[model samples]
Target: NASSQLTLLIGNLIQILGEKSLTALTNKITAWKSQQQARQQKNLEFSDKINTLLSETEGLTRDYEKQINKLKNADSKIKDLENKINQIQTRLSELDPESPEKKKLSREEIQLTIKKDAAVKDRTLIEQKTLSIHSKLTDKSMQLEKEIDSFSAFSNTASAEQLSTQ
Candidate 1:
């Protein structure tokens, strides 16, 4: 009869200890879940940064193309203007000094020269701007690329079952 009583008291003690341990276990699990939430927030911040960097690279590329096209258009226009200026120069040589066409073309010559100079300046400005943009674009895109690559290098994958033992 004394042995039976001792066995019952031991069983009771085991159940009480388990119930006490469960309360502490809940606190620990909740703390771990909070850490998970913090990690997830950090992941989102990094994701947003990458997207912004991607958008900047795209914008830089488009602007670079536009500048190149503008430069091309200016070059063609300058060529045409040069041809017209030379044509008028040769025509002026043959025309009478005050001939009606001569006077008309003389005014046109000054105007055309002004327009050509402006176009030249525009092309130079665009050229320099394009160079600067391209320089930054390369570094910016490469930085983004390197960061992403390094992030992959830092990453690891595992099955749940494999990690469960840990």
Candidate 2:
């Protein structure tokens, strides 16, 4: 009877130890799972922010190009207008007619010349504005591009995936 009782006590002790070990293991596994989930969430948030910034930067770049093109077109038209006005002025200066023939020019011609002068002045003003805008817009685009590059670098770092299969 004494031998059998000692065997029963040993068996109970072993069972208790096994239960404690299993409980510790389960706790560790649960903690590890929670930590992995948190890390995954952090990675996702970082990627989303980077993608959003990149997309915004891309859109701004496209708009900058369009605005620059418009500025170029306006500048080109202004140059053409200036050349035309110079030609007209040169021709007008060469018109050496007697007083009687000079008086023959119609009022409509005088009004047209006045209107052309106004248009030339307006174009010059617009060209100046475009140049000013170009300076500021280029600076903004450069800053945005720099920011995008930084974001991309950060995204690459945060992601645990390697680009190479090796």
Candidate 3:
């Protein structure tokens, strides 16, 4: 009778504690699940933002590359134009009054020389403006490049930090 009573008492205690413990465990598990879901959602949102930033960075870099290429092409063209102008001026110098060929030129040649000088002056002005524009573009490119570098560095650092935290 004593052993049976002792067994019955122990059984009842186990049943009571088991129900309480199970309830506590279930609550903890549910809370953990909710926290996990929130963290996962936050992580997904962060990843999307990072992807968007990466895309924008790629686009901006491509644009910068295109602009740089155009600048190079324009510089080459300008140099070629300046060389051609110099060649023309050198030929004109040969037809100067100090040269033996100056008096032998036709009346049309004189008018042509005057017109060429005016055209050369206009070209020089245009060249100056082009060079100014090129300078401004170069400065802008440099600034943009620096900004891109900083943005990339910061993004990389942030990504590393986020990953480490997770």
Candidate 4:
């Protein structure tokens, strides 16, 4: 009878202390799970943004190349037109006053010069914008990798702690 009564008292103390400890452990586990989930969410968001930026960077690169090619073609046309203008000027110097060909050649020269100028301006703008986006994308990629590394470190530490506890 004495042993049974003592056993009951010990059982009562166990329930009281164990209940508090168990509740504390549960709270800790909940907090850890919440933190892990938040990190995962951030990782997903960053990865998605990184992929979008990468795509944009690729598109901009191709556009920049296209613009450069257009500029080269325009430059070639300008050179050809310059040679033609020189030839027309020479012909005008030797032609009769009644000829209409000189005026037409002058107009052609003006149009070709204006077209080349516009192409140069377009290519410059595209190069500037493309380089800016490339720089920004590079920075974003580095930051994303750093964040992933940080998350990996946290996971490693958490796993180590869990294993130690076990």
Work out the TM-score per prediction.
Answer: 0.57, 0.46, 0.46, 0.45
Q: Answer with 1 or 4, whichever has the higher TM-score.
A: 1
Across residues 69-92, which tens digit of lDDT does each residue of candidate 3 receive?
A: 665665666566556656655666
In model 1, the worst 10-residue window by lDDT is 153-162
lDDT of 4 by residue, 1-166 (tens): 4435644655576587785656655565556566667667767877787687678767767776776676577667657766776776776688688878868867876776677677667757756765776676677678768867876776655544655874
Q: Over the stretch 34-92, how does candidate 1's per-residue lDDT look in tens digits?
A: 55565566578679889889898899999999999999999999999999999989889
Off by over 4 Å in 3: 1-17, 22-24, 96-166
The digit string of per-residue lDDT tens for model 2 on 39-134 reads 677668767866876676666566667656666665666566566656655665667755444343434346556766766676666566656656
lDDT value for candidate 2?
0.60
TM-score-wise, the better of 2 and 4 is 2
Runs in model 4 deviating more than 4 A are 1-19, 87-166
Best by lDDT: 1
- Sequence-dependent TM-score of model 2: 0.46
Compared with the true structure, the alpha-carbon lDDT of candidate 3 equals 0.58
